[PDB]
Design an enzyme around this catalytic site. Structure first.
Site, PDB file in Angstrom:
ATOM      1  CG  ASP A 111     -13.789 -11.053 -14.017  1.00 16.46           C
ATOM      2  OD1 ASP A 111     -14.342 -11.922 -13.556  1.00 16.46           O
ATOM      3  OD2 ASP A 111     -14.068  -9.909 -13.555  1.00 16.46           O
ATOM      4  CE1 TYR A 319     -19.680  10.768   6.749  1.00 21.35           C
ATOM      5  CE2 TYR A 319     -20.018   8.140   7.326  1.00 21.35           C
ATOM      6  CZ  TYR A 319     -20.821   9.606   6.720  1.00 21.35           C
ATOM      7  OH  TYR A 319     -21.804   9.587   6.212  1.00 21.35           O
TER       8      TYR A 319
HETATM    9 MG    MG Z   1     -15.441  -8.811 -12.381  1.00 19.67          MG
END
Ligand code: MG
Ligand code: MG
Ligand code: MG
Ligand code: MG
Ligand code: MG
Ligand code: MG
Ligand code: MG
Lengths: 670, 666
Positions: A111, A319
């Site tokens: 990517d 939280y």
């Molecule tokens: Mg990646």
DNA sequence: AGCCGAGC
DNA sequence: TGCAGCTCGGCT
DNA sequence: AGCCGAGC
DNA sequence: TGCGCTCGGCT
């Protein structure tokens, strides 16, 4: 030679020995990738292959300081593992005898961020040891447990070698990674975007550095801009937009843990990134301390950070809770969803290319972002002021000039010149030994001011003492000093001496316009106008859509009412009728196939909308009720037809302002 | 480092300084917030990670190496073996008292208890002074300080005995009795009704709540084999009814929300992973599918990927083992007005035996090995015939070795090793729960290399494992192999372990902790309960189907009376229409009436019918449905509870055969 | 000595 | 469960 | 020398 | 994004 204190290293059995140069060091994108590499290698591959994980983006060493370089643990690690030495030339075969590995193989995701890491690694070797690049020192392993062992079995088919061909390679690497080549990068990417824009109006074992840069890395550089630089239209980047799309879709009526929202975002909107980034995005959208959002679209239910630490003190995403502000659908009206271009991520319908808010949100919350080649920064502007300028422009008047304005900021913002402001905190003399500080310039955080200004003043010392009486949302320092020193401080500027003035300059208002073209905007007035013309045009579209839809609904109700009336009068019967005969009869009697369905398709005959009605529909109360709904639908389409797009816009603005008044009053009480 | 030392700590005002030890860093923050700016002079704040080392009987190396306890010691200014009887001694302390600030919950109480244990063991003299206090539960709490501050008081020898009861590895049998009394006494009131603190009262009134709560979460039910967290996970999966895989991390968030799970999500996510695991030695039947890297036998599951990146969903076996219809017979719990998971599910075979329920609580622990699902089904079928169940040996799915009974609840578990030639042996199975990498590191490596304390036995070895199988080929000298044979190949190669099961402790269906001596006893108790629930299921089905039959009968009647003109609703008012239906003797919604009984006249079930209902094909469809349902009531009526169970058993085995053959093919 | 697993 | 190395451009 | 924030 | 302890029975 072996390697002592690098726990995450899996050294090749033969590394640093007689077979050094036949050994490969595989650098991976993260620890998980390292495991896959270790698995694919097996016990046999353990001999000539070492594996070491990179955290992520690595230091750009080309123009980094000597300190930053010498202190970078990852880079020092790589140097130790491979046996590199700064300043050494690896021209000979003799010189190569001092390395523990003969090559580095980069293994990242396939990517854009993967590519960025490859480029940064290439940049590191090119900058320090260009000689190495001439021996084919860098390689990569490309990918699309079992699959891992198969990839490595077919190791050679996944293996690409970087190749140095000449000075074009040097120029390409420098273009991508030199701090001195920003302008060149703007040009580089301007051509890329235009070239791609054109193509869209229509339709090697050895990779050179030049081709890697100009065909692979540039894809990261472009995506970086696409994710980092806001849209003019809704003021969002894609990540933020996915967040809002998801909240709208979920339509929660009660608070939701940030981590679960994030999970929901990844699922519902095809967000393909790490969850740290997404949870930070969500926290950022919710923040509401001075200097953050003028209008937070998500509610900070819990500790989302404070002005004390510039929000760095947000509790962790497991939280804390959030949900949409009541202002969110007022600003981004549901009916307008019908006008948007929703994107698809592999057969999933995800977020729109942009929302179209009723006011330019890009001005409201300080659109900000750093990309490649360009960055964007906008200060916050006042919502009501902006509402008033839209009203002015709706009446064909001229929009008043606007100054940046930060909700709850008590200080001063003065225009010095176009896009240049002086932002001042507040300081006043209480008595001859005492000044009091009750506001800090915007984006100066209380703890930071304490540490970087007051502490140094206290310890040539200028002040005798200071005390703090801050609240979570307000600043109050009381400072003591000698008459003499106060008089001097006071003689010079008090604001000057106490560093309570900062300059805000905005010469990089870079945004994607409605067509998704990167554009530089000189004034916020230009931004407003461009927003205004698009938004007005979209109220036009809303009116056409509503007239059509409400019209179809009116026709639908007419047919339903007609059917009921005829049924209760004996004029028609369905009891014991074939379905075929029933359809045929309804056709012959001129009943219309589902008008709403037909209208949506327009953007056999179907009488389900009639026959799916309940038997209850034939009863007195329901007959009356159906008739009223039919008539009301008629008046509704009529009333809408009479109105202008301007009227609709004004209706929304008033609805928004009324709730903004309520919401902001409640916050001051709370 | 994580320390925020009190300004005056170390100085002349030492003994007037308080060190606040908090439960975790987050709590630390709220303490610093509630403290400053004035509070910063006389109060320090330091965070504990969680449970602290129990030092009472811990080894010296363990105590000396504990970073946390060393940090505390340095911060306070403590010193081992130093008595603190007089005032000349108290002078070396940097803080005069420790204030414990934990959650107002059972685990918080456990940490309080462990800190107390720490001080009492090392410096009992410090307790007689009133060294320890606690802060009960932000800038507002601290302003109302004294109303939140409680001081522990040493009162006598009975305080010593209580701390020792709770924390001495020598007082296990005492804790059993301690908790037995507690469980019995609370069981008594369950039928009836409903500043200073001695260590004896803390232990006997507060800590004991953790100890009991520790058992309730750690020790499984006999009925379904689950502990409550696991049960919350299945409840949530059943409710979600996912048809495609979901990220584990997201499933966990979902479980917290839908089932009121009140703990850190790390534990929850590990629970989910544990439920999905399917390598040798884990689950005989995993109720969740491990879509992704959930761990292997190579590292006994420790190699599972992060929950952030792994997926799961129900196994197809899940609802075969826990039929939906039975949900109607269960007792669902409530956590603050939200209906959450049941006290137990009631599966069709004893799942507690199938996947080897185990856990460690306080006083007791539970350990059950895995048993074969088909053998259990067979034994259930035998008991339905009125016959005695056959005895069962532990059996682990895909395990190629042997398990042989040595004595009562004691077994030899052996892997496989065979002599190939005079220089070669082959190892093709490791005893259950021996992981491949551990065996390689702790057995074969030392055999190859020797150690400081043992010689080498082998000349070489090679690995030919797959992800689910073990294969070592080992080379030896003829002489060495001969020696190893003489001594016992399995013995020499560490391929036999003992499995001892004398702690089969479970909660029974009433919720009472019980020790079972044999698995046949568990099987039998399970059997009686399940049989009677098949009774309840039949009663429930006869009722529900009956009502559905009456319902359809009324809908059919109305549709026929309408298409025959015997009745018209056209333009009648609501009141006149209802009054009319009553007078023609139509029944108020029978199904709603039925669910009502199980714990104005409503004719919506008729009038909500669509106009399509009056058409030809629909009249015919409605009549068939009415008639079919009538036959359904009778078909079910002809079935005994035992018939129903047998259908379930059969449907389960069929899918089990299909599922396990798919697994072998993959 | 350290595993097992639901907790902090 | 709380951390926080780095990129990228404008600005200081 | 370092913030801003969506990314690794 | 990965990443030391309790408690009991037993090896
Ligand atoms: Mg990646
Ligand atoms: Mg902002
Ligand atoms: Mg707690
Ligand atoms: Mg198990
Ligand atoms: Mg920089
Ligand atoms: Mg415990
Ligand atoms: Mg122990």
């Amino acid at each position: 030679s072996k390697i002592k204190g690098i726990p995450k290293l899996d050294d090749a059995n033969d590394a640093g020995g007689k077979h050094s140069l036949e050994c490969t060091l595989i650098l991976t994108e993260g620890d998980s990738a390292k495991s896959l590499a270790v698995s694919g290698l097996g016990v046999i591959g353990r001999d000539r292959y070492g594996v070491f994980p990179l955290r992520g983006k690595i230091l750009n060493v080309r123009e980094a300081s000597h300190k930053q370089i010498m202190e970078n643990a990852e880079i020092n690690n790589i140097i130790k593992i491979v046996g590199l030495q700064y300043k050494k030339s690896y021209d000979d075969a003799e010189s190569l005898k001092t390395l523990r590995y003969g090559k580095i193989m980069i293994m990242t995701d396939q990517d854009q961020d993967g590519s960025h890491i490859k480029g940064l690694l290439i940049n590191f070797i090119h900058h320090n040891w260009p000689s190495l690049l001439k021996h084919g020192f860098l390689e990569e392993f490309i990918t699309p447990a079992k699959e891992a062992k198969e990839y490595f079995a077919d190791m050679e088919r996944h293996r690409i070698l970087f190749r140095y061909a000449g000075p074009e390679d040097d120029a390409a690497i420098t273009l991508a990674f030199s701090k001195k080549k920003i302008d060149d990068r703007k040009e580089w990417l301007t051509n890329f975007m235009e070239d791609r824009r054109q193509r869209r109006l229509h339709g090697t074992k050895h990779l050179t550095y030049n081709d890697f840069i100009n065909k692979e890395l540039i894809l990261f550089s472009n995506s970086d801009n696409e994710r980092s630089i806001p849209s003019l239209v809704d003021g969002f980047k894609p990540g933020q937009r996915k967040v809002l799309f998801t909240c709208f879709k979920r339509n929660d009526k009660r608070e939701v843990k940030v981590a679960q929202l994030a999970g929901s975002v990844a699922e519902m909107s095809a967000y393909h990134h790490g969850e740290q980034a997404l949870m930070m995005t969500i926290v950022n959208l919710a923040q509401n301390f001075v200097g953050s959002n003028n209008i937070n679209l998500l509610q900070p239910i819990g500790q989302f950070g404070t002005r004390l630490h510039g929000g760095k003190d947000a509790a962790s995403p497991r939280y804390i809770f959030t949900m949409l502000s009541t202002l969110a659908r007022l600003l981004f009206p549901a009916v307008d969803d019908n006008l948007l271009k929703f994107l698809y991520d592999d057969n999933q319908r995800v977020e729109p290319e942009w929302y179209i808010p009723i006011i330019p949100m890009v001005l409201i919350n300080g659109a900000e972002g750093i990309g490649t080649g360009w960055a964007c920064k906008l200060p916050n502007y006042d919502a009501r002021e902006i509402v008033n300028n839209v009203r002015r422009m709706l009446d064909g008047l001229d929009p008043h000039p606007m100054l940046p304005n930060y909700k709850n900021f008590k200080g001063t913002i003065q225009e010095l010149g176009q896009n240049q402001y002086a932002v001042s905190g507040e300081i006043f003399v209480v008595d001859r030994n005492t000044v009091e500080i009750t506001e800090l310039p915007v984006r100066t955080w209380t703890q930071v001011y304490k540490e970087q200004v007051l502490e140094p003043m206290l310890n040539p010392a200028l002040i005798s003492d200071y005390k703090e009486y801050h609240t979570d949302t307000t600043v109050k320092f009381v400072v003591k000093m000698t008459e003499e020193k106060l008089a001097q401080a006071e003689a010079a500027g008090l604001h000057k001496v106490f560093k309570l003035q900062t300059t805000l300059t905005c010469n990089s208002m870079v945004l994607f316009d409605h067509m998704g073209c990167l554009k530089k905007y000189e004034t916020v007035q230009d931004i407003l106008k461009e927003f205004f013309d698009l938004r007005l045009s979209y109220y036009g579209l809303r009116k056409e859509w509503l007239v059509g839809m409400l019209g179809a609904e009116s026709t639908k109700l007419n047919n339903q009412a007609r059917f009921i009336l005829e049924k209760i009068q004996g004029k028609i019967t369905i009891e014991n009728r074939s379905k075929k005969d029933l359809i045929q009869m309804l056709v012959q009697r001129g009943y219309e196939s589902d008008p709403v369905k037909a209208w949506k398709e327009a953007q056999g005959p179907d009488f389900n909308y009639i026959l799916n009605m309940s038997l209850w529909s034939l009863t007195k109360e329901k007959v009356e009720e159906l008739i009223k709904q039919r008539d009301a639908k008629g008046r509704e389409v009529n009333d809408l037809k009479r109105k202008s797009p301007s009227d609709l816009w004004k209706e929304d603005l008033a609805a928004f302002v009324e709730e903004l008044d309520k919401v902001e009053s409640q916050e001051r009480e709370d």
